Design a protein around this ligand. Sequence first.
Ligand SMILES: CCCCCCCCCCCCOS(=O)(=O)O
Ligand SMILES: CCCCCCCCCCCCOS(=O)(=O)O
Lengths: 168, 168, 168, 168, 168
Amino acid sequence: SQIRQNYSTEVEAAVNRLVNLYLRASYTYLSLGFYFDRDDVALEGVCHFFRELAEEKREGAERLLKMQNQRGGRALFQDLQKPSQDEWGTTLDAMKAAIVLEKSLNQALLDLHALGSAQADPHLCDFLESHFLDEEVKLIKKMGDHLTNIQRLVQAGLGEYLFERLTL
Amino acid sequence: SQIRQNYSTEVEAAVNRLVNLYLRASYTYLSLGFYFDRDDVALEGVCHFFRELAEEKREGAERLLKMQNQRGGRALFQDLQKPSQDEWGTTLDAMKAAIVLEKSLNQALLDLHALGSAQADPHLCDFLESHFLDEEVKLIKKMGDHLTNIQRLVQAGLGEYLFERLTL
Amino acid sequence: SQIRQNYSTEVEAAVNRLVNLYLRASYTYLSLGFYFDRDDVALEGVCHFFRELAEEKREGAERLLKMQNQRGGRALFQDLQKPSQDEWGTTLDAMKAAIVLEKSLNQALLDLHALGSAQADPHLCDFLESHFLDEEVKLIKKMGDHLTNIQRLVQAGLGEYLFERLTL
Amino acid sequence: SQIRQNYSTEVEAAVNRLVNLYLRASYTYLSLGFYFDRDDVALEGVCHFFRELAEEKREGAERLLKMQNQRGGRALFQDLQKPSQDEWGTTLDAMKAAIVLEKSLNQALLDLHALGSAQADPHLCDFLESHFLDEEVKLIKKMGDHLTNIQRLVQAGLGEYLFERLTL
Amino acid sequence: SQIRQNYSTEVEAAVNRLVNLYLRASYTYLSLGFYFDRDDVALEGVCHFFRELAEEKREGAERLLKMQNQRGGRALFQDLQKPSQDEWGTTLDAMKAAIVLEKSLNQALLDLHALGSAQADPHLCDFLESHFLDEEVKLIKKMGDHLTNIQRLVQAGLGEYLFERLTL
Ligand SMILES: CCCCCCCCCCCCOS(=O)(=O)O
Ligand SMILES: CCCCCCCCCCCCOS(=O)(=O)O
């Protein structure tokens, strides 16, 4: 590419894998969101929480794709695997699966940052710090808070209703 | 009628029966609404939920009556039977009876649509789709959601209070 | 009822009968209104006059139902008989039937007031005076005025058109 | 056509015929409108009623033409026959001829819908329901109302003046 | 008195007794209100509910006093006995005592009305109907509603908190 400068093939490839990870995450949240929209689950605040995360993850993928092009790398898309579950259980189960998901994304961001540092790619480092690293830390903190409040509330049916009504 | 065109006697008659069904439903909701207004029941959000439905059902009847005249059919009114109950029990009992009621209305709409299709009456089909079919589906979904949340909340007294306060 | 005070069973029952009378009246006006909406009758001002009365009568029933609950009485609904006619003839015929109807309602209000006085129920008396007695007197006066103008106008077709156009 | 999908030659041709019918109708209303503008007829409200219908019918033709192109069909125009009359008599005569005209259009819409259903063309069905079927039913109802009021008014000269002044 | 007309000594005296009853009631509500303001009770919504009633009852006394002067009667004040309790227990206990109190006031209003009717004093009757009778009925209905919801909520501590938070 006429514009490519200091952009390793290793980072280029890892960025493509990270796009797949973010779209997979977006797909997982779409599934979570619509599960809580079922008439036999019916937790609107939980549905909205997860639908908003689906959107955030899709936007993360787009930011990575934009950056890939800015650096002269080439987007390569792969199949997107379906989410790990068809049904997501309680709000507690769902929030637990979500924090596991976010931790996996965070670890992928950290690995990518380590790769960038090894490749001496300061633009990539800045990119990850500016748009991802603190976003993830904040989100994981929030999910941790939610998990603590959910568990505090487990009269489990009553607790699930109240959390959705008064927190989400 | 000078204006009547492609409007079968079968549809005309079924429309009159459907008006009776909708007014009966409106009457049932009036009864439900005032039951929850009793000093010994006292659930204002439940009262309002049912009173609003009484109004919706009456408006459905008026829309059918207007349409009947538009097609050159003739409104024929019949006695309106009183609701199936004098007292409606808990919010749960009431919501259960309401979803049964809505399903019966929905089935009547579906039968009328099938009749219209058999009579090749596309204006009637459009009329039912535009003003009734999706309305019913949405309402039944909402009642299903409510039922799930109500059952989740059954400390039954506490649950009934909280649902009325925080959902209705 | 924990709140019931100075509210006789006789008044409670008569209030329930009066609700039935008001809903019957509302039903009668719904029928009148849609009759004048027929393409072969087509008197929009007459249709609107009666449709508005249907609404007023329904609201009267709701006021009675609200009052019943306020006093600790219990609403009991009964079958609603269909209106006395399927077709209502001329504006004159219709207005004549309407004033007969209103007189019957007025007489029921007067009987209820007499019952309340015999039961020494001053809250009921105030209720009837504030919300019904003068309303009826005013409405009956208006119908009387209309009847006089209608009869004055009977070239009967011309007269019916002009009354609907210039008065209603 | 590169875009044509599920659009039968039968429907394409019937749509072209329907365009001819709508333009013919527009032409008929133009003639009616200007007849009532004659100094020896002079009924401005009748003139305006028919001129507005001429415009509506032309717009119907344009909607059909637009739809034809959207589906990849090809507009084919044919000669437009002149209206059935040069002079249109009374408002009554004119309104009678208009309702006959609208019924013929309505029947053509119904036939086209039946053709679409036989050809399993759901886009065409939606198109007819959304833009034509209820429009026709409403218009025919209105003309029926007018006819009833006109006939009620037949002192025929006086009646024709009053209808034009107070209704149109 | 130069203005006194149709105002019996019996009514005059009963009006003075009723003023004492209303001020006693105001005093009782002042006590209730400040009890719920105690640091070891601490239910702000209950405190406010009763403090507002103290004000309403004082205003009732002033209206009676104004009316007494309007009729040419003479205000005579008597000692005001302290409330029946120093401490008022739970919200439930308090609301129960309040409805007993309101019923006693209502009965006094009814007795006064009966006296007025026996004395053929229509101004007094109008006065009681306009300013007191429906006010009492409404208040008693509300207290009945509250009692039902309170009892529904009795985890008694949790229930008392939730009622104060979500209803009062
Ligand atoms: C325009 C009034 C027509 C009423 C027709 C009479 C049927 C009564 C059915 C109950 C209506 C209950 O309606 S509601 O508005 O009170 O909920
Ligand atoms: C955009 C014009 C297309 C006209 C097509 C020519 C057909 C003429 C039919 C009369 C139109 C009468 O139309 S009107 O507007 O005068 O009432």
